Design a protein around this ligand. Structure first.
Ligand SMILES: CCCCCCCC/C=C\CCCCCCCC(=O)OC[C@@H](O)CO
Ligand SMILES: CCCCCCCC/C=C\CCCCCCCC(=O)O
Ligand SMILES: CCCCCCCC/C=C\CCCCCCCC(=O)O
Ligand SMILES: CCCCCCCC/C=C\CCCCCCCC(=O)O
Ligand SMILES: CCCCCCCC/C=C\CCCCCCCC(=O)O
Lengths: 86, 86
């Protein structure tokens, strides 16, 4: 009981800590400095965490990385779009 | 067996994806733009993940956030030092 709350407590802080940065990027479409390779590596891990979370029945790990996915994936999309404009 | 390997696989990619950014910050001591509040929130969650990882017997979650701690904490330290120089 208290142990799941701990994970959700953790998930809340780590996910929303730098969330305003991703939101700003999505809003302004400014992707200068963003590495495509780093985000692909990052997303690869995020997907793997989701698989891990399912196999572990860990909703804390699950919701943390699902929200991360919904924040990171649009950032990479915009980055790839801006990259191709040149 | 394969499920723990999945977590370690995930931990490898998410932790080392943006690790060169933290290393660069530690090396150059350039902390412009870094929010103290965001890192304190982030570290609060990281610590909570560690507690969660211990209570879950999850070495994937554990090693991911311990390494994160060793990367994030020095960044905040340098940030607080640079902040006080003014
Ligand atoms: C998130 C966008 C990255 C841009 C740079 C952000 C700088 C913040 C400092 C380090 C990177 C964040 C660490 C990675 C945060 C990813 C969150 C995650 O994957 O959760 C997994 C948990 O289930 C297991 O603990
Ligand atoms: C905006 C990014 C693209 C979003 C597309 C949809 C995102 C799908 C994310 C995860 C799919 C896996 C869902 C698994 C549910 C786990 C629940 C369970 O069975 O315990
Ligand atoms: C099973 C996981 C499948 C997930 C597939 C994800 C593919 C990407 C899908 C949608 C990308 C996000 C689109 C959101 C639009 C936001 C506006 C913008 O980014 O410009
Ligand atoms: C450089 C940052 C400061 C580092 C200080 C030391 C870091 C300590 C990090 C975590 C301490 C908790 C260790 C718990 C071990 C878990 C193993 C287990 O019992 O399963
Ligand atoms: C149980 C967890 C206790 C952890 C306490 C952590 C307190 C901070 C300790 C050390 C800070 C990191 C010091 C590393 C020096 C790197 C060089 C530098 O940052 O300038």
């Amino acid at each position: 009981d208290t142990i799941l709350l701990t994970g959700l407590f953790a998930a809340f802080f780590t996910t929303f800590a730098f969330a305003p940065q991703s939101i700003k990027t999505i809003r302004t479409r400014n992707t200068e400095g963003i590495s495509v390779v780093m985000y692909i590596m990052f997303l690869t891990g995020v997907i793997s965490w989701i698989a891990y979370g399912i196999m572990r029945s860990d909703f804390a790990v699950l919701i943390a990385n699902i929200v991360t996915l919904f924040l990171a994936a649009p950032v990479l999309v915009i980055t790839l779009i801006n990259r191709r404009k040149k």
